[PDB]
Amino acid sequence: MGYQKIQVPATGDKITVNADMSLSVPKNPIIPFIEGDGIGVDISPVMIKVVDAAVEKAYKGERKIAWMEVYAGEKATQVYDQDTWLPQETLDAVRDYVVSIKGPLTTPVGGGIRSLNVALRQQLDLYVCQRPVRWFEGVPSPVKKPGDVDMVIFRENSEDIYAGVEWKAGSPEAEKVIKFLTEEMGVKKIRFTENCGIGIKPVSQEGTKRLVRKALQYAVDNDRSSVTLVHKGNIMKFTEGAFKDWGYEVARDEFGAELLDGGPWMQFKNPKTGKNVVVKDVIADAMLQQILLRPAEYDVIATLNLNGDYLSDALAAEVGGIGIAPGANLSDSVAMFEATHGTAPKYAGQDKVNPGSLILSAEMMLRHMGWTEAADLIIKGTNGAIAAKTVTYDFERLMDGATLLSCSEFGDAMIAKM
Template identity: 30%
Template sequence: MKIAVAKGDGIGPEIMDAVLSIFNANNVPLEYEIVEMGKWVFDKGFNNGMTPEAKQTIENLGLLYKGPMETPKGKGVKSINVTARKTWNTYANKRDFQTLHGVDTVFSKAGIPINITVVRENIEDTYGGIEHMLTHDVALSRRFITRPGSMQVIRYAFEMARQKNAKRITCGHKANIMKITDGLFLECFYEVAKEYPDLKADDIIVDDLCMKLVTRPDNFDVVVLTNLQGDIVSDLCAGLVGGLGFAPSANIGDHISIFEAVHGTAPDIAGKNIANPTALLLSGLAMLRHVGLTENAAIIENALLYTLENGVHTGDFGDKSTPAVNTTQFAEAIISNFGKQPQAGAKEIIANKPGTPTPMKLQSNAMMVSTEAEEETIVGVDLFIESDEQPAAIAEKCQRHAGVKFKLVNISNRGTQVWPTGSVYTNLVNQYNVRFESIEDYPLNQQDVIGLYVSMSGNFKICSFELLNMWGDKKAYSLAQGQ
């Protein structure tokens, strides 16, 4: 079985070489095709951080094992890590966090075991990176949460929880504030939960989740979240078990999957052969299990756990009264411990059942569209305008343009209503949202909206606009604060 390997930047090549030496010593039946990705590829003029040959190789093989990679700063280019995940639709980012004996934390010292799996949506949310300056003072980031994308990652989380023999799966969210976007994600969670009656499914507001994770992490089993919240919570969980140096990461897609270390490139220690390869090794073990090499994975993980229990450590962790080993020596210690069983957390050795990661050859992009349950109607429009005038003056101008189909119902600034009611204590910026709705809820069409846009543009710079849609009797837009 052949997989693509990108060694990465900074400490990437040395920790990847260490891990591959462990795999080779265990006769892991893999071949490695090295591909060109990372900052040095950006520097050669490839704006997505990978050569066309690397992209084609990964798509042919279906599996990428990668070291940490750096994105050049100040050059307007996108993160190579995010680009890779999104390009190949690796919609589920799975990170396992478990107590490792020999890696001391406040929880291990207190005898509180941790075994949490965070599943983070990996494609959408603010990680779309779709941003605009609406005025010289106001920046906008668009946050996309889709029903098909949410269903993909949530169904994966439930399937994975069942395979893990989990008892509980929790949805972290902020639907109390972002009622439409996070509300849609939460709605999908409970829709999928109906198919898994054997699992206890519940939800928690993400800030409350963070507080409970740092007080009683042993109460959680599997947690699924949207992209940005999942990114933050997964790093929080890494801190619970010793840091990002012990945090494996798998990016799972239907056709291509990526296994990587999520810590940084540590350029300050690059080339010194002192980096900790544990996170990359744990990610590699997840990869071995993903392709059915369960026996190799168990033998190597048991050797790793045994090595940690016996106090072998690199300079970033462990008992400072005992000498640290370098990267190569750490790998050699693991190899010497093949066949040994740790006192805690030993993995069952299950015979390999290797599959193949080779993806299906696709001829076109998959279009994910759910069935529209009710009839869609346009009932108004939000026009985002630039102005430094007071709300009453803006309202007076807007009402001149309303015509016979529209009525001005609300003006807000940074999401807070400032007309027809509001407070002079609300600070303003030079970008308003003026909301027009149809008179007597008469259905509108896009030509009506464009006519209003053209008319309003005589008085204002219109930065952007959004249709106010309804499906049946359900509003598909939020109200302003105080409306």
């Protein structure tokens, strides 16, 4: 409930969730969107227009998005009470309406928080962190063959050392944990027990299997070639090692994966395309080498929080796509797509920053709704504008003979290329 600030589109309808979490998407769906703080005023209108253009050229009016504006961050406090940085009404709107997109958000001053995005993650139980990575023709890249990178990283976001369970060194909290470890557990292998900060790395079967289960289903829902379990399990047998083993179980149990000629890898055939998927694993630090030497050999990646973070950032720099990084945070059904950059307060409203991040994360949204034809138009429009060197300042700094475009202008350049 809380239907007092959301103005539900009249010509809109709801996206719905059925068995297998498949999605029935009407041609006039309601998509909640959060404008985002700071430069959110700039990129979100451009996004809506670019998406509206792409949907409009692919289907010619048959399909159309009923944009509904929900509120979060500093705007929600000016729309809600000053205490409601994150309205329950907003959360109901994202839960009742499966799909939604959001821009960057300010962090509330002080408090037990350093991000509002984490507040949404915690409160909606968003445990997958999707981050596709590819090269766009014309983007300056530091590697000789950036076009060989075409991966989707599925990163767990509820577990691992990022949970935040940690205690300061030299603190009574730490000593009670440290001595408990050395007294009752027989913990050795610690080199310095005094003035020692401690952290906990939890990796469960549920949190592990619901990630790989999402990563595998994306491999068949999009007809991808392989799924890789990235892990540092040879040194952490029971967390990252347990992640791998649990990951291999899901493939065997819930997708019909057989041992490929004796393992350690597995493979099954897509039930809806007949193509041979592969389920393999790679050691984390080795993976960082592989993406430089043989990136063409990897497609979908399933990994833990820390590994996914380091791996996605490395790939982003590899394709010169740091500033245009698409991203999505998923639950069992809820799917929230986001721009990965900050709010950039100093440029707010000035129509300068790059909307590519939010635009491409919107391409994920369309891809996730089955509207792959509209999504391809966003990709084509992206390749077009960048190849033409009509880009925002961030790219113009790195190109020779480039044309500076504003945020809205760059969006229009995309629309003209699709």
